[PDB]
Amino acid sequence: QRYYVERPIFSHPVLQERLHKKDKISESIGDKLKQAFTCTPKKIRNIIYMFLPITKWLPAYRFKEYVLGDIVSGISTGVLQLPQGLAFAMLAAVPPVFGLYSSFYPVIMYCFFGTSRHISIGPFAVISLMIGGVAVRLVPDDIVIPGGVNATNSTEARDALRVKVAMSVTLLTGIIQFCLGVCRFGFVAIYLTEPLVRGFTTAAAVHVFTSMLKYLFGVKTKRYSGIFSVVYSTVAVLQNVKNLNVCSLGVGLMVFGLLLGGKEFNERFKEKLPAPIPLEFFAVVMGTGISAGFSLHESYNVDVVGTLPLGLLPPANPDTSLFHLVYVDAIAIAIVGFSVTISMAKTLANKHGYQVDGNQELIALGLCNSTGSLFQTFAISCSLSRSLVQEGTGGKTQLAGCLASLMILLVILATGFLFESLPQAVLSAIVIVNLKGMFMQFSDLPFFWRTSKIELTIWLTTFVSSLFLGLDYGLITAVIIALMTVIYRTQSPSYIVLGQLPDTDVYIDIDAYEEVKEVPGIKIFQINAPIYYANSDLYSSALKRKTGVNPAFILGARRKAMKKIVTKSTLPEELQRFMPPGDNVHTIILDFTQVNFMDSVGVKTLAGIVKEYGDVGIYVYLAGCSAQVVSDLTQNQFFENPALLDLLFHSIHDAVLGSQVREALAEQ
Amino acid sequence: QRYYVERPIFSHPVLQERLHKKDKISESIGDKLKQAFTCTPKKIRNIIYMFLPITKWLPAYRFKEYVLGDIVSGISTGVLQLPQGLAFAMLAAVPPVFGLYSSFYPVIMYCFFGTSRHISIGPFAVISLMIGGVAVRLVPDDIVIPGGVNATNSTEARDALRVKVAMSVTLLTGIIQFCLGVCRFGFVAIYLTEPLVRGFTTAAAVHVFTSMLKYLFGVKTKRYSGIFSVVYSTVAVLQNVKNLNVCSLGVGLMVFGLLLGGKEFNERFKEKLPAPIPLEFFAVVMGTGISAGFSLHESYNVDVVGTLPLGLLPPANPDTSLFHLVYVDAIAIAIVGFSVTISMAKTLANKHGYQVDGNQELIALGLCNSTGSLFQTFAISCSLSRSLVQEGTGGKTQLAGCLASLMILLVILATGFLFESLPQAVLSAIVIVNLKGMFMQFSDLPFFWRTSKIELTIWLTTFVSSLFLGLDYGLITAVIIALMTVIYRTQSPSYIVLGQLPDTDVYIDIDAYEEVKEVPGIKIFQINAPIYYANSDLYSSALKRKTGVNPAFILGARRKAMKKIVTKSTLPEELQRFMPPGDNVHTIILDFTQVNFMDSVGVKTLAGIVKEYGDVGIYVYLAGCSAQVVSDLTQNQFFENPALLDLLFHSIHDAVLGSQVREALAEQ
Ligand SMILES: [Cl-]
Ligand SMILES: [Cl-]
């Protein structure tokens, strides 16, 4: 009922003498490998449930509740896949049909191999932009085809060569992703914080907006990429806005307005409506119907999707020769794609709670990309707005994605010619209106401003670095800056001078309470950070500052007054009332409860502190050293003198009692 | 004499109620600026003693003891400056005389502006190699001079253009260093640990060895630089070893042998010899005498220094136009130079102990470089072997460097033509033999292997990165890797399950002592690392593993048995002896004494842990939360329910007593 202890003062020697070490258990790397190579049925089942996750949940799928939600979610996400897929195919400098292949082959496989049950794997704009840049670089727009035969200008051969470049790029991306996954690369997903994921995603949103502005405005500018891409693209659009198409801009604007109104209607009418209406289906149908009936393309020169072929291309081995240079690109796409997909998988897991294993995620994506590259496709990561829509509608399982893949297959097989008249402005408006859920992530700035300025710094710096400095070189910069923020937290700790609560052993801050009173002749210093090379000199200077006791000025003042082995040396100064007034502190207790670790530089600084405080005549005691800290002290030869083991104490109260009893004994 | 406390169980509400907050002191940035703009005589003196350090020590120079040591040290360091200066001028693709200017103008100024009193500022090989590469790139060896007039081949105009390129490079380097120094860039010197500094210095030693191998062997290969420079240079030397000069190799080898024998003699005879003999003076004199008497250059084609001009060139403004491209180089030289000089300044300070302020170091070097760039010089950092020699001989003050500068001035003014016959092999041997003190730093591998494997990792990785990947891109990699080692220490902590020492409040590890016995029904978990985004899921998994209590399997087992707001929910399972045997733990105490900080991800994981443990029916208590940790918990909305403030406890014993009294009360 009451805190009552009556024990002797537990310094380091006393506690070590009262204890006996317990025998260690066997540790053998050979034994670690031993059980691994022994086959057991349970681990065999676990290997399968780890590599083929569909074997786990699909036989246990619940038909009572999940069926309706998955059907609705699949319908909505496929209705979103179609225009997003076509537009993202347009973004990749490839014929629009290959977007449909990109949205069918890798979707079905992720159902077999993937982990997250709320994630939609379709083409993504930034990866599509990278592939389009790769295609442009290898085969430029102004390329002379040796075939001839046909009249002036040709598009089929150039597009075929571009899609072959994409086939090599995505095959290399899939191979790299599979190799990373099998080499246990899923641990790196732990370094993508929520602040670093949300900033990255919002930067990607801005990039997509500025990329599709070109098609929204009907302008025919360049495809500036790399560093400073967003600003270059937006200024190129702004300069060439004089060549805008009034018809295309008008149809795009009315499509965007209808989409925004429908989204607002769905949000307001969430409760009474059993399921959100497929608004994008109405938008696409109305756009293609208006374009076909009014013949906008032949009338006023409106950009159109084109002719979407009707049929499944037979599996085809991709070129591996292009791997010569596409390698530097493939690696970037595989990094960016993995980062984005694991970011949203972690977001969905935090929202709901399930297995989000990144290793099997990378394995599944690597298998999908390669097993798709052989099927006339391109790089496929997780889509962002579509994933948000799928999770919002009520998506429960991955069968929703399979339904979307089935509907896209139906579009490829039967209704591929209905969208041959669909204007590109409709696709641009559909893509832009779906970024709204991603631009809503800008609300984190006030919340993080109120919560923690370091998290706000991470958010702002990843947003800026992934906006103005590309999206592939922005992720690495953001991760490094997050790690340096951790280092900064370790390099600017809270230096607290402690004080003793009366009649108790509670030691808390002296500047933040009135009961807390300092123990006469004793000053306690606390640092809530490890003492290592980065914050060692800072720790020593703060110790000299806060406690008000620095050996340098004390020794100098002894010298000025004179003008007119044992750890410490007693003061030999002749009795004189010329010392500047002070509290004649005899011991300085250092709090090591919060010090996690110490390296060689920290140990050297600690030895220097002890030596220079003992030269003046002031003891230094270490309170609450952890086992690891004592190991670092012993290994770095801090305890060469066995008498330095008496400085350590188990707690602050033990150190204070030791100092008091030492002073009492010294008087006698 | 004995640890005796009798206080009530201090949970968070009780302690907070017993305390009252103390009024904060005024904090105003305006007040910070206020006193800065007010002029006081003491701060005026301090500004001067900070910018002109010579005003501090020079009037207080002690003539009794320092004079002889400084004279000897200055003689030795100047005798080392001469051949090192000439060889490093040879390394920079500039006439050898400019090495003499590089060793006079910036040395005298550092005496006025520098801080460290044991540091020698002369030309350095790697900086000289960078400048020589800059000169080669801007003006190649095969350049057509429009002057004509003279016969085939010309060297004066090409060398003048090269030295003008060096004049722009070093002026930009000095300007950049001064700007960094005045912008308070000396804080970055805290991130250069000893393991990193020593690895960097040994890599520089290997680079210098492989660079001067070319002159030692008499081979006339290329000047490969950049990435993979050491291997390229050494293979180029090895392939062309068939064109070696027997005479030059022989004289270089005998010079090296004489130098090594003299060094061994000096080391063995340290006590009886009043002062080390100037061995390099004998070596240079003998080499030039033999070359002049035997006429090696005209006889057997031995490489020679050349003609060293006799006179001081009048101050001359350097070109600023070359700053167009030399900028990318100048910045690299200023970084590498500052890193090296602050590394050895810190090493000397740790050896002795004095002011090593890096800001004034950068200011002094920036002033020296620019004020020399205007005097026909090049980039000048701290020399390594020469600094070691100066500190070893007994150098006390910077007047030793001034003596070396004076002797170099005498060489320039009077005896500049004595060394016109000195072979380059002698210079190469002299430079190589002085690296011995730097190759002795390889002994850190066993010491760091015994002491700490992470420090050994830092040492090895900085050595490899600064050896095989250049010296300018190696420093940044080493610093980043050191910071990631800190992050790794935070991501692999020691998960310790604690136990109670009998009849006392000491809680220590349960697997490392026999007295330590676990409190029945209570399991204590300790992590000596902050709970943040990097090690949050790892912490939760370790909590489930070590303590043997995971809510997932417990709930699953309740479900299997069934087959046959308040923070926690009591167990409703009907009384059945089908639970797998356990210790029916009722509370799990988490130790937060060693947790420095928590971010949003850590708080979310902690809330999830508390919720999922309360669903089963097991309390979770937090023991020893710091003020900063409680602030992070409160800001991140962990304490939205006021009942969660009762979970916090001041110490482990308080939490154990609270759990015991709660269990006792529950029975009644
Ligand atoms: Cl998107
Ligand atoms: Cl050197």
Side-chain angles (χ1 to χ4, degrees), chain A residues 19 49 217 271 288 294 340 352 362 369 400 502 504 561 575 580 642 655:
Chain A
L19 291 175
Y49 278 58
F217 274 137
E271 290 183 354
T288 185
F294 262 61
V340 161
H352 291 184
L362 208 43
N369 287 0
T504 60
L575 288 79

Side-chain angles (χ1 to χ4, degrees), chain A residues 187 191 455 491 505 600, chain B residues 7 187 191 455 491 505 600:
Chain A
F187 189 83
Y191 301 112
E455 260 161 354
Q491 199 168 297
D505 71 304
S600 64
Chain B
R7 57 157 169 113
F187 189 83
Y191 301 112
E455 260 161 354
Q491 199 168 297
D505 71 304
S600 64

Side-chain angles (χ1 to χ4, degrees), chain A residues 84 88 124-125 208 384-385 435 438:
Chain A
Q84 288 207 4
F88 291 160
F124 181 49
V208 173
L384 318 180
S385 58
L435 301 184
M438 281 215 307

Side-chain angles (χ1 to χ4, degrees), chain B residues 27 34 91 163 177 207 226 252 404 446 470 491 494 548 592 601 616 656:
Chain B
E27 70 301 344
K34 194 51 196 49
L91 268 205
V163 77
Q177 280 195 357
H207 266 189
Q491 199 168 297
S494 82
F592 274 64
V601 178
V616 168
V656 170

Side-chain angles (χ1 to χ4, degrees), chain A residues 238-512:
Chain A
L238 262 302
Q239 302 183 350
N240 287 56
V241 78
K242 300 284 102 175
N243 320 341
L244 85 84
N245 290 319
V246 181
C247 190
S248 169
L249 188 64
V251 60
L253 260 294
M254 61 215 288
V255 161
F256 179 76
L258 192 163
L259 282 155
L260 198 63
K263 289 290 190 173
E264 182 146 350
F265 169 70
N266 278 282
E267 286 172 340
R268 184 189 168 185
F269 283 49
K270 273 210 177 284
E271 290 183 354
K272 62 183 75 66
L273 285 177
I277 52 171
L279 192 74
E280 289 84 5
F281 154 70
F282 267 60
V284 171
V285 157
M286 161 285 268
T288 185
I290 294 300
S291 186
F294 262 61
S295 79
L296 319 172
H297 173 82
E298 316 84 336
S299 166
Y300 303 134
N301 200 317
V302 179
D303 278 353
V304 189
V305 159
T307 44
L308 296 191
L310 272 302
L312 287 198
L313 302 205
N317 190 300
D319 169 61
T320 64
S321 72
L322 295 174
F323 295 2
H324 66 300
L325 167 71
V326 308
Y327 73 119
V328 51
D329 314 356
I331 76 186
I333 299 175
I335 303 308
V336 170
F338 164 62
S339 73
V340 161
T341 182
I342 204 57
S343 80
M344 201 94 68
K346 277 171 65 176
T347 297
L348 265 297
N350 294 359
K351 190 68 181 294
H352 291 184
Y354 51 88
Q355 283 74 350
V356 70
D357 194 316
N359 279 312
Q360 172 72 300
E361 202 88 343
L362 208 43
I363 290 289
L365 261 173
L367 277 188
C368 285
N369 287 0
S370 303
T371 314
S373 173
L374 272 80
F375 283 60
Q376 302 286 305
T377 74
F378 58 64
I380 331 293
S381 302
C382 82
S383 309
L384 318 180
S385 58
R386 163 156 32 112
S387 289
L388 291 190
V389 166
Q390 174 165 359
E391 85 159 278
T393 49
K396 314 282 181 73
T397 59
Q398 202 55 38
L399 283 180
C402 169
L403 178 64
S405 179
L406 213 68
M407 191 175 48
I408 292 287
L409 174 60
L410 171 149
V411 167
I412 293 179
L413 279 176
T415 68
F417 54 85
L418 271 304
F419 315 131
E420 299 183 340
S421 307
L422 184 62
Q424 292 169 358
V426 167
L427 299 190
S428 190
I430 290 176
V431 173
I432 286 176
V433 79
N434 285 125
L435 301 184
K436 168 188 176 302
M438 281 215 307
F439 285 138
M440 270 328 150
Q441 290 186 350
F442 269 123
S443 81
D444 295 336
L445 298 168
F447 165 69
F448 281 144
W449 168 270
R450 291 184 291 113
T451 290
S452 295
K453 301 260 171 31
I454 301 195
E455 260 161 354
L456 162 69
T457 292
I458 292 180
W459 204 105
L460 268 192
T461 197
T462 189
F463 179 58
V464 167
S465 176
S466 299
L467 175 60
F468 288 127
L469 177 63
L471 193 83
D472 53 298
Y473 306 138
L475 179 86
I476 306 300
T477 300
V479 173
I480 295 300
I481 287 179
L483 304 185
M484 321 295 88
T485 55
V486 164
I487 296 298
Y488 162 71
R489 303 178 94 139
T490 61
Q491 199 168 297
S492 65
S494 82
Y495 305 107
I496 297 168
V497 174
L498 290 189
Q500 154 160 314
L501 202 73
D503 286 331
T504 60
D505 71 304
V506 174
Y507 287 78
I508 43 180
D509 194 3
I510 191 46
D511 302 76

Side-chain angles (χ1 to χ4, degrees), chain A residues 1 3 7 9 19-20 187 190-191 451 455 482 484 491 505 508 513 533-534 593-594 600 635 653-654, chain B residues 1 3 7 9 19-20 187 190-191 451 455 482 484 491 505 508 513 534 593-594 600 635 653-654:
Chain A
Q1 189 188 0
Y3 190 106
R7 57 157 169 113
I9 293 155
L19 291 175
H20 305 302
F187 189 83
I190 206 68
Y191 301 112
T451 290
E455 260 161 354
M484 321 295 88
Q491 199 168 297
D505 71 304
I508 43 180
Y513 289 113
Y533 64 86
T593 55
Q594 313 258 359
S600 64
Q635 278 176 342
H653 199 53
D654 295 327
Chain B
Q1 189 188 0
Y3 190 106
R7 57 157 169 113
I9 293 155
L19 291 175
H20 305 302
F187 189 83
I190 206 68
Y191 301 112
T451 290
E455 260 161 354
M484 321 295 88
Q491 199 168 297
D505 71 304
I508 43 180
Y513 289 113
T593 55
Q594 313 258 359
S600 64
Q635 278 176 342
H653 199 53
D654 295 327

Side-chain angles (χ1 to χ4, degrees), chain A residues 595-611:
Chain A
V595 168
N596 310 359
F597 66 87
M598 295 192 36
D599 60 45
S600 64
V601 178
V603 172
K604 289 184 183 293
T605 305
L606 200 54
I609 281 179
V610 170
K611 191 211 160 282

